[PDB]
Coordinates of C-alpha atoms (C1' of nucleotides) in Angstrom, one line a residue:
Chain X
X6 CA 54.1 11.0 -13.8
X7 CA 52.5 12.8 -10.6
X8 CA 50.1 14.2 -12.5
X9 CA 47.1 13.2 -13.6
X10 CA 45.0 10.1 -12.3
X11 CA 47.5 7.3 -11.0
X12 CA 47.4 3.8 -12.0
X13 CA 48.4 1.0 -9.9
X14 CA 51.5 0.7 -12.9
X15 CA 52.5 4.1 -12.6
X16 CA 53.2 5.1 -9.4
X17 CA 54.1 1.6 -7.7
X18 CA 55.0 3.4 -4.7
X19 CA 51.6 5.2 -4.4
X20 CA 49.9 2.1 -3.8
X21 CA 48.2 0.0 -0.5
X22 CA 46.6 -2.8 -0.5
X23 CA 44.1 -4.7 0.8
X24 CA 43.2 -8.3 1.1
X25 CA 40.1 -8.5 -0.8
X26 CA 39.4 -11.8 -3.6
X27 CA 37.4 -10.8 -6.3
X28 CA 34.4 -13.2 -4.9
X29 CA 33.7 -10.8 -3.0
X30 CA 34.0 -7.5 -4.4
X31 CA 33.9 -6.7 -7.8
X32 CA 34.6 -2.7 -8.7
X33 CA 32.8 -3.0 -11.7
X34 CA 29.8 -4.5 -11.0
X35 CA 29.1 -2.4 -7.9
X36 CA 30.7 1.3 -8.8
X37 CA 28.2 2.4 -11.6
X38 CA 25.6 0.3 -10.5
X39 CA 23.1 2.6 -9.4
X40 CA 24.7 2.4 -5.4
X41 CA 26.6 5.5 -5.4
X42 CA 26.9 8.0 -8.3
X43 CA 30.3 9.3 -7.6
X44 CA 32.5 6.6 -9.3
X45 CA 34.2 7.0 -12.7
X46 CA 36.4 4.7 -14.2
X47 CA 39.1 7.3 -15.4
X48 CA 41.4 4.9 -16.4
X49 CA 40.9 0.9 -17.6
X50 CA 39.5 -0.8 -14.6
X51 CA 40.5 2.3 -12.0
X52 CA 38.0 4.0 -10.7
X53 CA 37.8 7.3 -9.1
X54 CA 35.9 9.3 -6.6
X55 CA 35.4 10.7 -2.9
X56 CA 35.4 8.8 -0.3
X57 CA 35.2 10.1 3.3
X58 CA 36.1 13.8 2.3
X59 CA 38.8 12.8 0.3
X60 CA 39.7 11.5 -3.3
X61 CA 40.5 7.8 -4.3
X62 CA 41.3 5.8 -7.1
X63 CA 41.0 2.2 -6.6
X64 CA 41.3 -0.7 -8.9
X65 CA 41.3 -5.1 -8.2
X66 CA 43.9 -7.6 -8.8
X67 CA 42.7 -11.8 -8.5
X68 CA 42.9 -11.6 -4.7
X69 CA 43.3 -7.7 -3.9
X70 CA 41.6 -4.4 -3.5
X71 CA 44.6 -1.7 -4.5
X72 CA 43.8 1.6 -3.0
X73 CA 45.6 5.3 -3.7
X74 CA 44.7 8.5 -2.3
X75 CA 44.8 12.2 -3.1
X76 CA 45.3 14.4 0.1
X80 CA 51.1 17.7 1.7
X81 CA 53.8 15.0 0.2
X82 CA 51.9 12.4 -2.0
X83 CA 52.6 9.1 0.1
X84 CA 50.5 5.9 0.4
X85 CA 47.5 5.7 2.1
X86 CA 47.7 5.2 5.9
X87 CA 46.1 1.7 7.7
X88 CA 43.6 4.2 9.3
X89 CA 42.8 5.3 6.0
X90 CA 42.4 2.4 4.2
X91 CA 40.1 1.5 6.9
X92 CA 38.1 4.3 5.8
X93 CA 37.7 2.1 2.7
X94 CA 37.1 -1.1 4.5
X95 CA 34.0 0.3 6.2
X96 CA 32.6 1.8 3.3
X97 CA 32.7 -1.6 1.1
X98 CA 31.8 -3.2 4.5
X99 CA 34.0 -5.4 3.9
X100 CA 33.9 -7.3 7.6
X101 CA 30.3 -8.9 6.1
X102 CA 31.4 -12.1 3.8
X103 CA 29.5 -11.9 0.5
X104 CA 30.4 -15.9 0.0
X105 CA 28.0 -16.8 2.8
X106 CA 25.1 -14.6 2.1
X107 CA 25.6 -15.8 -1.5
X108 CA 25.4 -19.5 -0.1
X109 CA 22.6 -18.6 1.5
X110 CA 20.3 -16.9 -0.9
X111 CA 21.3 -19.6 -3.7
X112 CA 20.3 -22.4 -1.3
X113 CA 17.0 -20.6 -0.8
X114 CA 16.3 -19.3 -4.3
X115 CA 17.2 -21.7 -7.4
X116 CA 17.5 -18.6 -9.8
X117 CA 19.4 -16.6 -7.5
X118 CA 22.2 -19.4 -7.2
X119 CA 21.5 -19.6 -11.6
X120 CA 22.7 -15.9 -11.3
X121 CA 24.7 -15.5 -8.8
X122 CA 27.8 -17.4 -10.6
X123 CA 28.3 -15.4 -13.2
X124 CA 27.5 -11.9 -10.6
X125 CA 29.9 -12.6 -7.8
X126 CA 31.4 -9.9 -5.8
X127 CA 28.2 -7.9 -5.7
X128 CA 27.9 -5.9 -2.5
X129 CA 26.1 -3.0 -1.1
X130 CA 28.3 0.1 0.3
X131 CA 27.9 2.3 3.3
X132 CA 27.1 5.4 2.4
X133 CA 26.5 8.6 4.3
X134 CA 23.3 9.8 5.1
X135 CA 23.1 13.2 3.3
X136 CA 24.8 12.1 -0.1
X137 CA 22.8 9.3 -0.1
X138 CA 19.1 11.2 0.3
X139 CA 19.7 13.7 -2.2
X140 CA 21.1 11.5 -5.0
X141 CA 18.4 9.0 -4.5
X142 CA 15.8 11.8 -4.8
X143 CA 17.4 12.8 -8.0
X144 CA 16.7 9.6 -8.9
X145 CA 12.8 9.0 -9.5
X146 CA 11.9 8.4 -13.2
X147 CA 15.1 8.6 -14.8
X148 CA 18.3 6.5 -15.5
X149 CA 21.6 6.3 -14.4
X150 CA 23.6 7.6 -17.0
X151 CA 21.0 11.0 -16.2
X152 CA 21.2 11.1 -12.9
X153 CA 25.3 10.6 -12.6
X154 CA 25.2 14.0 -14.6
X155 CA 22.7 15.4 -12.3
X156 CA 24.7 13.9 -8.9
X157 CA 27.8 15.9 -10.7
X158 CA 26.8 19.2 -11.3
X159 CA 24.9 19.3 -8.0
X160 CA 28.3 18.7 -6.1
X161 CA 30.1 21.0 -8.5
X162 CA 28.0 24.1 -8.0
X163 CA 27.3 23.3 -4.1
X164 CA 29.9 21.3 -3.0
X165 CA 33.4 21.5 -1.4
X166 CA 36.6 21.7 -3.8
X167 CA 38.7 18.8 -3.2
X168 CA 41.2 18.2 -5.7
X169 CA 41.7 18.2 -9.3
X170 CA 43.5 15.3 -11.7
X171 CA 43.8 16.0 -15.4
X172 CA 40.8 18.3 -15.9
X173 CA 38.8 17.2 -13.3
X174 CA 37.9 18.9 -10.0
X175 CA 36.4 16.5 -7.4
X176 CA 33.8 18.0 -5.0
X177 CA 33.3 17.0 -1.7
X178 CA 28.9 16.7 -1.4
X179 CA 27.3 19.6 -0.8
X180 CA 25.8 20.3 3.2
X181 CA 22.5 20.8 4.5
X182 CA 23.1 24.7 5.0
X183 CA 24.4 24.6 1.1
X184 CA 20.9 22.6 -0.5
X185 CA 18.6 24.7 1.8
X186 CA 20.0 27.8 0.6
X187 CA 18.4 30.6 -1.0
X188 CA 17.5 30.1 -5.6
X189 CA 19.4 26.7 -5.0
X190 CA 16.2 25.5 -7.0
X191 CA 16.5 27.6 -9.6
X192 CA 20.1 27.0 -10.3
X193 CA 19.2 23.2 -10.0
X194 CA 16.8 24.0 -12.9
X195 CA 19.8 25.5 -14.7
X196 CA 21.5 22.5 -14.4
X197 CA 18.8 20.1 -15.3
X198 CA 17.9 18.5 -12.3
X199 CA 14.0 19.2 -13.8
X200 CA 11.3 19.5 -11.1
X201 CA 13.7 17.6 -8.8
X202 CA 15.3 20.9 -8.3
X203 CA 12.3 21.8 -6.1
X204 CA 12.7 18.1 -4.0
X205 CA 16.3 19.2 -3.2
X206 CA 15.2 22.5 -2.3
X207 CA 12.2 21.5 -0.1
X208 CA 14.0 18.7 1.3
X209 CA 17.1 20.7 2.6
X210 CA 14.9 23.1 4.0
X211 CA 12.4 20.7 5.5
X212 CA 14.7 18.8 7.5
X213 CA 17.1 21.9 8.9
X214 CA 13.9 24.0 10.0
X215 CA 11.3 21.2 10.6
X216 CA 12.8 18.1 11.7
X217 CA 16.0 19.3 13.7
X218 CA 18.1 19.0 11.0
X219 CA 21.2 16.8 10.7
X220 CA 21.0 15.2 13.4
X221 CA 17.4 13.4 12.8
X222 CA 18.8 11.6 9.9
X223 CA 21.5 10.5 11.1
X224 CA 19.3 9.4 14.2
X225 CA 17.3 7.0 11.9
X226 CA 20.6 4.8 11.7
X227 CA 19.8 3.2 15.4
X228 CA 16.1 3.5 14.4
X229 CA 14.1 0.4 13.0
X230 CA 13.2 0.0 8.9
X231 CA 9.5 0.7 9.6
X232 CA 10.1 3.6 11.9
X233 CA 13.2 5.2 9.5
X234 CA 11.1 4.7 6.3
X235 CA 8.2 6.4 7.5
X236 CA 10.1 9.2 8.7
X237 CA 11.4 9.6 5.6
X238 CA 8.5 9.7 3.3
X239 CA 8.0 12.9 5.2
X240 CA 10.6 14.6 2.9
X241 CA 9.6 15.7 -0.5
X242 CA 10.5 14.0 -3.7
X243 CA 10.9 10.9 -1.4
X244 CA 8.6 8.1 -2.2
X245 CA 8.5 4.6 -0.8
X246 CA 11.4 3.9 -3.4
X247 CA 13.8 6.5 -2.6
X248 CA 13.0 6.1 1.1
X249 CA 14.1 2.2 0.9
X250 CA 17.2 3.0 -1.1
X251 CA 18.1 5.2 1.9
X252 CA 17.5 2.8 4.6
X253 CA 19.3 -0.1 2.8
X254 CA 22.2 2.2 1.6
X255 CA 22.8 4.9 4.2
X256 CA 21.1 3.5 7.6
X257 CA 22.1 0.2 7.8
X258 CA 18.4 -1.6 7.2
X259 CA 20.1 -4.6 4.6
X260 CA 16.3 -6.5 4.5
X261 CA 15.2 -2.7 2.5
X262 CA 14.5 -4.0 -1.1
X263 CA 13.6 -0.8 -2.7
X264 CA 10.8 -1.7 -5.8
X265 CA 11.6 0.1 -9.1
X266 CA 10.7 -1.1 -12.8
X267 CA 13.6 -4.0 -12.4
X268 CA 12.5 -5.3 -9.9
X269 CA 8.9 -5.5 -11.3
X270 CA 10.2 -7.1 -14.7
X271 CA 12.8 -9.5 -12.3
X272 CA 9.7 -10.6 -10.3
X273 CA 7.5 -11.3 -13.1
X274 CA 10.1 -13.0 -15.5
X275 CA 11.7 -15.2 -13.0
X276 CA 9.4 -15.9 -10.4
X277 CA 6.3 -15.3 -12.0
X278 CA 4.9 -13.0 -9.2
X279 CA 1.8 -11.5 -9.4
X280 CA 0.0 -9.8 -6.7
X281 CA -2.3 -11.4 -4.5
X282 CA -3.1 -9.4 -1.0
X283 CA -3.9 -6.2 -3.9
X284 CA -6.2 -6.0 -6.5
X285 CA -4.6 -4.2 -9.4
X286 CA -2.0 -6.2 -11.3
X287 CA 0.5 -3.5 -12.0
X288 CA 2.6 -1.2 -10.0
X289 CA 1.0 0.7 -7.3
X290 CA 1.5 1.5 -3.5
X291 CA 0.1 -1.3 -2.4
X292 CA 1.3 -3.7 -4.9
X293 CA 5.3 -2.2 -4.6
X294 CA 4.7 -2.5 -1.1
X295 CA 3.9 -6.2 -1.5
X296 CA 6.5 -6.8 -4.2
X297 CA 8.9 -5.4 -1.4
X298 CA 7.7 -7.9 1.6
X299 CA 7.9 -10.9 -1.5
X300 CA 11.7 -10.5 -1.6
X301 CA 11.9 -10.0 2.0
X302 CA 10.6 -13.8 2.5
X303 CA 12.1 -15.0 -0.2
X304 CA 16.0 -13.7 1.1
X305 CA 15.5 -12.5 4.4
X306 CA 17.5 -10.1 6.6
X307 CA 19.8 -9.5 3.9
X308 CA 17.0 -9.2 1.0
X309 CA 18.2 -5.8 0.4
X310 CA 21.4 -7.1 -0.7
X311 CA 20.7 -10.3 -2.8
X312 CA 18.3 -7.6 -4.7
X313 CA 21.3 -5.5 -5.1
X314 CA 23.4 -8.8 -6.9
X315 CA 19.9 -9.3 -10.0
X316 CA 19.5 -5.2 -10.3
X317 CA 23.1 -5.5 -11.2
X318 CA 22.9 -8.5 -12.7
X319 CA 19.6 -6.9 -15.1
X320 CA 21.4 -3.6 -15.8
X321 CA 23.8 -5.8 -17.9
X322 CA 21.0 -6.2 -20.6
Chain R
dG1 C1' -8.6 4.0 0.4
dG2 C1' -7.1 3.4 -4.3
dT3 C1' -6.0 5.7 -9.3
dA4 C1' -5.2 8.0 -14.0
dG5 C1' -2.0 11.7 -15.1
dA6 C1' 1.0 15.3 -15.7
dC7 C1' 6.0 16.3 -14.3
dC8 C1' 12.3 17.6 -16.5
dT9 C1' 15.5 15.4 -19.5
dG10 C1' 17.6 13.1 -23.0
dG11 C1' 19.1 8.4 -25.3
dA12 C1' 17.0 5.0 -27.7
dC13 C1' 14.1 3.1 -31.3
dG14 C1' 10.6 3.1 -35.1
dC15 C1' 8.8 4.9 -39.4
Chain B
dG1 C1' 15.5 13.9 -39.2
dC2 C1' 10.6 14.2 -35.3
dG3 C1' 7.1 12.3 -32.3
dT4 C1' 7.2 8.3 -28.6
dC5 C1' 8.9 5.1 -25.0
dC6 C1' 11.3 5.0 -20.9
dA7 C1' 14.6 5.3 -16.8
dG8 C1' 8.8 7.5 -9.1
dT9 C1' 6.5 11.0 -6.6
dC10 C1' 2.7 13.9 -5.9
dT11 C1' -2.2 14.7 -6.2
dA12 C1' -6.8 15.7 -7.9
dC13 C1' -10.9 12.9 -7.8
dC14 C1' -14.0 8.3 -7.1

DNA sequence: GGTAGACCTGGACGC
DNA sequence: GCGTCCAGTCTACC
């Protein structure tokens, strides 16, 4: 009864909701899609994870979002609360225009977009967001959601625990950058991204003035905040882009993997042109990046969010 | 300036 | 069953 993960039939009473139709937020199309790495759907269509410092379980009806957290007297979750939830979704951004919008521009996109509704990109925080996306290069999801959790578990804050799982809050700066972190990361097969982690914590505390330069690149422009991060090892011109889109509010970053490649080439037919060698490459990611950019605009960051989804169910 | 080529770790084939 | 293919970043040369 008050144990274990709750479900929206369970404990009625431990339930808020919040206006939300499903054409324009779908849970399951945007949870393990390769945004965040922190969402598990514990129960049938309720999913589970932490979200600002605190755990949440959060599942969809036809027209709304129903939210439930785990702080203390179990009670439902406040308005300033669920606004916490509001601004990570960004929900004040209307998917059903930007959909209009990239379907009247793009044929296929519109072809795709039908059966792909609610797919939109989340806020993340700066710091959660670098470090999973740099345990991300060359390797897959399912991999790196292992990764993501044993990284939190050994580093990270305890939260709370439901059934037999403790939720961790994501580790800090101070906790990455400290001393055989890469050697336990090895332990827990993070590979030779246990060094990235490593070198990265310790690169921006006591080389780039730490915390505070990140979250700095968030009033910064895309050009300026992607180069800056490139600086970091283990980030590439991939993992910086998923950052900028993701964490620092640059929506027109489309970061180029092998999807986006195999999207591009199946149904556009796009080839290079301002580069000479015909596969993937800096130059040729880097114009595969600007293709999108024209082809959706501002927002290109996000329409390339809806096909990634969209190709992982294949 | 622009490349082959290792670099962790499995799940997924193919034979 | 076992050796590949596959889900970016770094770097030693050309």
């Amino acid at each position: 009864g008050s144990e274990g993960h709750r479900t929206l039939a369970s404990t009625p009473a431990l339930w808020a909701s919040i206006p939300c139709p499903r054409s324009e937020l779908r849970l399951d199309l945007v949870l393990p899609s390769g945004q965040s790495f922190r969402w598990r759907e514990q129960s049938p269509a309720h999913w589970s994870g932490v979200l600002a410092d605190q755990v949440w379980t959060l599942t969809q009806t036809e027209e709304q979002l129903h939210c439930t957290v785990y702080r203390s007297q179990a009670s439902r979750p406040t308005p300033d609360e669920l606004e916490a939830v509001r601004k990570y979704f960004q929900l004040d951004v209307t998917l059903a225009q930007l959909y209009h919008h990239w379907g009247s521009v793009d044929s296929h996109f519109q072809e795709v977009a039908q059966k792909f509704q609610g797919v939109r990109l989340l806020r993340q925080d700066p710091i959660e967001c670098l470090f999973s996306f740099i345990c991300s290069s060359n390797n897959n999801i399912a991999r790196i959601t292992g990764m993501v959790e044993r990284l939190c578990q050994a580093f990270g804050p305890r939260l709370i625990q439901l059934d037999d799982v403790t939720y961790h809050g994501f580790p800090s700066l101070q906790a990455l950058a400290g001393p055989e972190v890469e050697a336990h990361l090895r332990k827990l097969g993070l590979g030779y991204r246990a060094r990235y982690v490593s070198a990265s914590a310790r690169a921006i505390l006591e080389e780039q003035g730490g915390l505070a330069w990140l979250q700095q690149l968030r009033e910064s422009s895309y050009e300026e905040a992607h180069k800056a991060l490139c600086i970091l090892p283990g980030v590439g011109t991939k993992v910086a882009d998923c950052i900028c889109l993701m964490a620092l509010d640059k929506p027109q970053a489309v970061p180029v993997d092998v999807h986006m490649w195999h999207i591009a080439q199946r149904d556009y037919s796009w080839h290079p042109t301002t580069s000479q060698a015909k596969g993937p490459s800096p130059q040729t990611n880097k114009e595969l990046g600007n293709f999108f950019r024209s082809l959706w605009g501002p927002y290109a960051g996000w329409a390339q969010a809806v096909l990634f989804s969209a190709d992982l169910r294949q």
